[PDB]
């Protein structure tokens, strides 16, 4: 599934890590809640917590993030907002 | 009409959210601008930093401070507040 990015505020390696983490989450789970959970858990494996992930098709958000930890992208027809 | 699915605080902030949500329903047509107003109203009254997610179809894992978490439905629109 194609990974287009709407807003990226980090490095290229971190962007690709988020892309593969969303891909494995959508392949492992079919419920949006479990997909966002799996993104945050494979981020909770190799990254310190207070990260946050949202997975869905019809959702807006208003958040304030710390520096260099904000991405919002699409993988297929599902929007993923991953901020910290 | 407010449909509380999970409310981790005391009912005063929930009542304030219901009141300003009704005011935003009268003021604005779109739940997008209502979603903007929900965060912009409660960020300054209860200090930084609040976070709000509003939509009709979304899954999310949340990290919040205690007594500062709510998830509810205004009609068919789901609204989530946390830290």
């Amino acid at each position: 599934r194609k990974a287009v990015i709407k807003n990226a505020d980090m490095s290229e390696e971190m962007q690709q890590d988020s892309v593969e983490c969303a891909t494995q989450a959508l392949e492992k789970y079919n419920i949006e809640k479990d997909i966002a959970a799996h993104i945050k858990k494979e981020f909770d494996k190799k990254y310190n917590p207070t990260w946050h992930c949202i997975v869905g098709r019809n959702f807006g958000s208003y958040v304030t993030h710390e520096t260099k930890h904000f991405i919002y992208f699409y993988l297929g027809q599902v929007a993923i907002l991953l901020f910290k | 009409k407010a449909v509380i699915k999970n409310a981790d605080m005391s009912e005063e902030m929930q009542q304030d959210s219901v009141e300003c949500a009704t005011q935003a329903l009268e003021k604005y047509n779109i739940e997008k601008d209502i979603a903007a107003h929900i965060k912009k109203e409660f960020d300054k009254k209860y200090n930084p930093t609040w976070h709000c997610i509003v939509g009709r179809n979304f899954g999310s894992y949340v990290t919040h401070e205690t007594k500062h978490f709510i998830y509810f439905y205004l009609g068919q629109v789901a609204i989530l507040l946390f830290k």
């Binding site: 807006g60 958000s61 958040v63 904000f70 919002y72 929007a79 | 903007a36």
Partner: peptide, 9 residues
């Protein structure tokens, strides 16, 4: 951040 979804995207 101002992120929102239009009707029928």
């Amino acid at each position: 951040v101002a992120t929102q979804i239009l009707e029928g995207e």
